[PDB]
Design an enzyme around this catalytic site. Structure first.
Site, PDB file in Angstrom:
ATOM      1  N   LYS A 157      -9.945   2.171  -2.480  1.00 56.24           N
ATOM      2  CA  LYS A 157     -10.118   1.688  -1.109  1.00 56.24           C
ATOM      3  C   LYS A 157     -11.562   1.866  -0.613  1.00 56.24           C
ATOM      4  O   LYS A 157     -12.009   2.992  -0.323  1.00 56.24           O
ATOM      5  CB  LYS A 157      -9.138   2.448  -0.220  1.00 56.24           C
ATOM      6  CG  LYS A 157      -8.991   1.933   1.195  1.00 56.24           C
ATOM      7  CD  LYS A 157      -7.881   2.684   1.924  1.00 56.24           C
ATOM      8  CE  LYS A 157      -7.874   2.312   3.400  1.00 56.24           C
ATOM      9  NZ  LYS A 157      -6.802   3.033   4.115  1.00 56.24           N
TER      10      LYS A 157
ATOM     11  N   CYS B  31      -5.772  -2.453   2.008  1.00 58.82           N
ATOM     12  CA  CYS B  31      -5.452  -2.084   3.414  1.00 58.82           C
ATOM     13  C   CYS B  31      -6.579  -2.518   4.343  1.00 58.82           C
ATOM     14  O   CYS B  31      -6.930  -3.718   4.366  1.00 58.82           O
ATOM     15  CB  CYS B  31      -5.023  -0.595   3.430  1.00 58.82           C
ATOM     16  SG  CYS B  31      -4.182   0.017   4.844  1.00 58.82           S
TER      17      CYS B  31
ATOM     18  N   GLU C  50       0.815  -1.202   0.000  1.00 62.74           N
ATOM     19  CA  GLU C  50       0.000   0.000   0.000  1.00 62.74           C
ATOM     20  C   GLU C  50       0.869   1.281   0.000  1.00 62.74           C
ATOM     21  O   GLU C  50       1.894   1.346   0.688  1.00 62.74           O
ATOM     22  CB  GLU C  50      -0.968  -0.013   1.186  1.00 62.74           C
ATOM     23  CG  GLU C  50      -1.678   1.294   1.516  1.00 62.74           C
ATOM     24  CD  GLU C  50      -2.554   1.842   0.404  1.00 62.74           C
ATOM     25  OE1 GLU C  50      -2.476   1.392  -0.758  1.00 62.74           O
ATOM     26  OE2 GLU C  50      -3.342   2.748   0.715  1.00 62.74           O
TER      27      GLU C  50
END
Lengths: 332, 332
Positions: B164, B191, B87
């Site tokens: 995300k 994430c 990430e």
């Protein structure tokens, strides 16, 4: 490494006499008492069938009732408030269920059959909530058979029932009920439902603080999945989960549906901690002291219910299930 | 215990020279070849930032590009077809993102910024699909910043981007895209999205065979969850998952948002098996040989997509999200 409970000598003596494993652990909040303790002791019972699978049904069932009574007496010495038995705890397991013998003899009324009535007496006598997974005959709906768990209050009153939502290839028609008890809000994810994150989720959404997973499962693959699925469900849902599997080799012959059960019952917590498993072979009682306000400590770090975007998933899933659904796929 | 790959001597020599860990494992179908092998080699890259967090941005980014180039060259020696970076791989991490320095200098066009252009060259040169998690400036929509992963084809063409979906308390607006590549269907769970079973599910439903989870995460609690969540997602969805976290201590000062990254990148498989993790501190490349038809072997035992009752959950979730929702709760 969880603190072991200093269970009374009397309990250890009784468990020894009765030939079952006794283990006790605590899941406690950080030493600093920022919030109120919300303490409940849970009990998980795993056992083998006492008589051979071919034994008369009245005798098999009453022998199981007597076995559980002895274990629950020890659970009461340890201060257990909520106890859960294994899947189909009053019968030998088989992979399938059919509307013929032996299943139809083992099957009972959830509301007032002999196992529920027995559990009502147990519950009242020890001031203990009792979760009883049985094979149900639904006489109001054509005598159809269900994999059902009956939830009995510590007053002896039947709170209600919940059915097995997921069936390997009879699918549960009662949704995702949560039972408000004196000792917390509980739900029951029956057996194979442990494989479905959505099943655990809906119980948590409906308010469960503890989700019991009474199971009856065999084989190397199942045992490999066992330490992961219920454990992850506690984390994802900020709750406690209680994984129960039976022990022993006895079974209905495989020809009935045409097996080795590995026990290893455990409790998992919202912080990812868990108890060591009970034995792979012995009958056992696992006592766990749960602080149900532990989630509030976890929620100082992350709150997955707040960040879950459940309205968005409801929309995406509805679109995905449609018969004309072309998935969201990108190509060169 | 997975078979270790006999990675070429040249790769081991290069990794030693370049000061990173090299590990290789195979996830293979049962010896009996009942079905076709569908073999892809994946690469997971974890690293620390080469320069201090305060270094000029052009220099930090170009140093990261040079570092990744050296690692991807070794990945190519090992036959990696699809490689994924960590990430925000071109920048120091901070817990938050704001529309000011340093973030606005690090941010790039997903379609044609220097990191994507660099990845296009890498990809074409090694015939390798490249997954590049970056901080995106969306110039067509007011210069708003997104946590984005760009998927680059082995031909060097940009396949598209994914954002995300889950943000701790900027939430992704692109749903759950799946990228069809020459080497399989892939998706990216960025994430904190690893904490949401529904996020993994929708990627699998939309066809992902491999779900990458590039992360940047710190602390004892996060590390306790790390071995469970991605591992469970592989099992529940009958797919492969690839968990990546950065290493090192360097960070933007904590005052920027008012940290110790533990690496341990791993691959998990549909049968519950997984690789040993990469180092907690060293830069590293994990090579994994995946048979994407392994799910078909698992599906001889159980198929969770067939038994998932997703239409029922779509209905229950929609009901649950309503502002006037009284949960399914039973009381005495």
């Amino acid at each position: 490494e969880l603190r072991k409970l200093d269970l009374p000598r009397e309990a250890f003596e009784a468990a020894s006499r009765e030939d079952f494993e006794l283990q006790g652990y605590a899941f406690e909040a950080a030493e600093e008492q920022l919030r109120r303790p919300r303490i409940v002791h849970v009990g998980l019972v795993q056992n083998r069938i006492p008589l051979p699978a071919n034994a008369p049904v009245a005798e098999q069932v009453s022998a199981l009732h007597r076995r559980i009574k002895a274990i629950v007496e020890v659970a009461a010495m340890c201060g257990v408030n909520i106890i859960c038995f294994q899947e189909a705890w009053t019968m030998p397991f088989a992979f399938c269920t059919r509307e013929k013998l032996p299943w139809t003899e083992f099957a009972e009324s959830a509301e007032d059959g002999p196992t529920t009535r027995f559990c009502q007496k147990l519950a009242k006598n020890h001031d203990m909530v009792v979760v009883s997974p049985i094979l149900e005959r639904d006489s109001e709906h054509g005598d159809v058979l269900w994999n059902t768990a009956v939830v009995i209050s510590n007053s002896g009153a039947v709170l209600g029932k919940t059915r097995k939502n997921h069936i390997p290839r009879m699918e549960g028609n009662l949704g995702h009920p949560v039972f408000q008890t004196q000792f917390g809000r509980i739900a029951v994810n029956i057996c194979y439902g442990r494989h479905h994150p959505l099943n655990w989720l809906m119980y948590s959404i409906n308010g469960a603080e503890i989700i019991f997973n009474p199971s009856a499962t065999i084989g190397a693959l199942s045992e490999s999945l066992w330490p992961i699925e219920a454990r992850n469900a506690a984390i994802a849902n900020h709750c406690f989960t209680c994984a129960i599997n039976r022990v022993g080799t006895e079974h209905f012959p495989n020809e009935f549906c045409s097996g080795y059960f590995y026990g290893s019952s455990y409790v998992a917590a919202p912080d990812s901690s868990r108890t060591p498993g009970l034995s792979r072979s012995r009958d056992g009682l696992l006592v766990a002291k749960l602080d149900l306000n532990l989630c509030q400590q976890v929620n100082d770090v992350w709150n997955f219910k707040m960040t879950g975007r459940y309205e968005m998933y409801a929309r995406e899933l509805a679109e995905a299930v449609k018969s004309n659904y072309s998935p969201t796929i990108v190509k060169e």
